[PDB]
C-alpha cells in the first residue's frame, strides 16, 4: 500500500464527511457509505501505530510506582479484571463511606494545558480545531505521548485499554438494531465526526511544518484516532485550572480505573493542595469492588460516550421536541409568556423514567402551550402576572384544572404517537433478548431501543393518571390552590 493511495482515500473521506447532512431519511445510507470508506482505509493500515509487548496488567505496577513518586494514594486497593465492567479497583482493606481514600496530584494529569506545552504545542497554536475543541486536543496529546517512548505519562498510557465499546467499534448489524430510535442519529454523527476529523488531521499533519516533529508524521492510522477519541470520551473530566478562574479537560490516572454504580458524585478537585480527591461512595469491604458515581447521564449517553449500558439507571431519560406553532393564533402571547418565564418558544425537553416524567421547565412550557387567551392575559398583565409566572413550573399550583387536563391529554397523545414511530414493540425487544444469543455490543443497542420505549410508555401511563386526577378536581369543582 503506497502512501499516495492512503492520501487519495483520506481526501475522499474528508470530502464525503464534510458534505452537509443528506436529510434524515438518507442518514443510514450515508452511514454505511462512510463505514465502507473507513473500513477500506483501515484494512490498508497496520492497526494501532504503537503497541506494547506486555499484557495490560503487566503495566499496573509501573502505574502505581509512577503515581506514588508523584504523591498519589497507592495503598488500600488493587487492579482486578472484573467480568461485568472490565478492569477496576478492588479494596484490600475495609473502606468506610466518606473516607478520603484516593487522591491524584495535578502533575499526573493529562490536560489541555499539558497538551499545549508538549511536542503538540506548535501545531496546537496553529490549528483552529485544536484551539476550539479541548477534547480533540486531549486525543492528539494522548497519541503523541503514546508514540513517545520517554513520555512522562507512559506508565498511564501503557495501562489504558486497547479497545472500547463505544459505537465506533460496533459492527454494522449491531448499529442496525438502533434504526428508528432517537439515539441512532447521535451514533451517525459520532461516526461522521470521527471520520471527518481523522481525514482532516491526516492531511493537516502532512501539510503543516509545525507537525514535523510529531511521531504522527511517520504513522497515523484510523485505528489510532478511533482509539484516542474513545479513550478521551470514555474517561475525560472537567477540572478547574491551576489559578481556579477557568475550567479545562483532563485525564485523571489511577482514579479513572473506578467503575460506575448508582449514587452521588463524591469526587472533587482540591485547589489548595492541587489534586483530585475521591471519598468513598459507600462502605467497601476488603475484596469488594470500589465504585464511583460517574454522573447523572442517560443510558444513551453512557452507551455513545461512555461505551456501556447501565441497568437500573435511575437518571435515564429520552428527548421530546416541542414548540409553539407559528400558525397558533395565540403564538405571540404564548411566546411572550415563555420568554418572561425564561423558556424558549421551541426546544428539546426531556422525559424521565420518574413520576412526574417532566421537569419544572417542561411543565411550565406545557401549561403555556395549552393556555386560553384569558389565561395568557393573566400571565402578561397586572400586579399578579409575575407571581403567576413564578409558579408555572410548580406542580402544586396549576393555572386551572382545565389547563392541566389539556396538557396531560396532549402529553399522553404525543408520547403514544412517539411510541408508534419505532420499528419494534417493547414485547418484541424482550423476546429478542430472551430467545437470541447476542454480543455485548448488540445487547447494548437492543436495550437502548427498549429503554427509549419503556420511558415513553411510562410517560403515557403517568399522563393518563394525571389527566384523571385533574379531571376529578374539575368535576368536583375543587378550589384551586393559591400560592400564599
Amino acid at each position: 500500500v503506497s502512501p499516495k493511495e492512503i492520501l487519495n482515500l483520506t481526501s475522499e473521506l474528508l470530502q464525503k464527511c464534510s458534505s452537509p447532512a443528506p436529510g434524515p431519511g438518507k442518514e443510514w445510507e450515508e452511514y454505511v457509505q462512510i463505514r465502507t470508506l473507513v473500513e477500506k482505509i483501515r484494512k490498508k493500515q497496520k492497526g494501532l501505530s504503537v503497541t506494547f509487548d506486555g499484557k495490560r496488567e503487566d503495566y499496573f505496577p509501573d502505574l502505581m510506582k509512577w503515581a506514588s513518586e508523584n504523591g498519589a494514594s497507592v495503598e488500600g486497593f488493587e487492579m482486578v479484571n472484573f467480568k461485568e465492567e472490565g478492569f477496576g479497583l478492588r479494596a484490600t482493606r475495609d473502606i468506610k463511606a466518606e473516607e478520603l481514600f484516593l487522591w491524584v496530584p495535578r502533575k499526573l494529569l493529562m490536560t489541555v494545558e499539558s497538551a499545549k506545552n508538549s511536542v503538540l504545542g506548535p501545531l496546537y497554536s496553529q490549528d483552529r480545531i485544536l484551539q476550539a475543541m479541548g477534547n480533540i486536543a486531549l486525543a492528539f496529546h494522548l497519541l503523541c505521548e503514546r508514540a513517545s517512548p520517554n513520555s512522562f505519562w507512559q506508565p498511564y498510557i501503557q495501562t489504558l485499554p486497547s479497545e472500547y465499546d463505544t459505537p465506533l467499534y460496533f459492527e454494522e448489524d449491531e448499529v442496525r438494531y438502533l434504526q428508528s430510535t432517537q439515539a441512532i442519529h447521535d451514533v451517525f454523527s459520532q461516526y461522521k465526526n470521527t471520520a471527518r476529523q481523522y481525514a482532516y488531521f491526516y492531511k493537516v499533519i502532512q501539510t503543516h511544518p509545525h507537525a514535523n516533529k510529531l511521531p504522527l508524521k511517520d504513522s497515523f492510522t484510523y485505528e489510532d484516532y478511533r482509539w484516542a477519541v474513545s479513550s478521551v470520551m470514555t474517561r475525560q473530566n472537567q477540572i478547574p485550572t491551576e489559578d481556579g478562574s477557568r475550567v479545562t479537560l483532563a485525564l485523571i490516572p489511577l482514579w479513572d480505573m473506578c467503575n460506575h454504580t448508582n449514587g452521588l458524585i463524591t469526587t472533587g478537585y482540591n485547589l489548595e493542595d492541587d489534586r483530585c480527591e475521591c471519598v468513598a461512595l459507600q462502605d467497601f469491604r476488603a475484596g469488594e469492588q470500589i465504585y464511583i458515581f460517574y454522573g447523572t447521564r442517560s443510558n444513551a449517553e453512557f452507551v455513545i460516550h461512555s461505551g456501556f449500558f447501565f441497568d437500573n439507571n435511575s437518571h435515564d431519560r429520552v428527548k421530546i421536541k416541542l414548540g409553539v406553532s407559528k400558525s397558533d393564533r395565540l403564538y405571540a402571547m404564548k411566546a411572550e409568556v415563555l420568554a418572561r418565564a425564561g423558556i424558549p418558544t421551541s426546544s428539546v425537553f426531556a422525559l424521565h423514567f420518574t413520576e412526574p416524567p417532566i421537569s419544572a421547565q417542561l411543565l411550565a412550557f406545557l401549561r403555556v402551550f395549552c393556555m386560553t387567551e384569558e389565561e395568557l392575559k393573566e400571565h402578561l398583565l397586572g400586579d399578579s402576572a409575575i407571581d403567576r409566572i413564578f409558579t408555572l413550573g410548580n406542580s402544586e399550583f396549576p393555572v386551572s384544572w382545565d389547563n392541566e387536563v389539556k396538557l396531560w391529554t396532549f402529553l399522553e397523545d404525543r408520547a403514544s404517537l412517539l411510541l408508534k414511530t419505532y420499528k419494534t414493540t417493547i414485547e418484541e425487544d424482550k423476546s429478542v433478548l430472551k430467545n437470541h444469543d447476542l454480543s455485548v455490543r448488540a445487547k447494548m443497542a437492543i436495550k437502548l431501543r427498549l429503554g427509549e420505549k419503556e420511558i415513553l410508555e411510562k410517560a403515557v401511563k403517568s399522563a393518563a393518571v394525571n389527566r384523571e386526577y385533574y379531571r376529578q378536581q374539575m368535576e368536583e369543582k375543587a378550589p384551586l390552590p393559591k400560592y400564599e
Binding site: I136, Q236, I265, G268, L271
Partner: peptide, 19 residues
C-alpha cells in the same frame, strides 16, 4: 458541598463543524 465536583466521562461536543 464539593466546590469542584468531577463528573467522570462528562459529555463534550465533538461536532467540529458546528463548534
Amino acid at each position: 458541598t464539593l466546590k469542584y465536583p468531577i463528573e467522570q466521562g462528562i459529555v463534550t461536543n465533538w461536532d467540529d463543524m458546528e463548534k
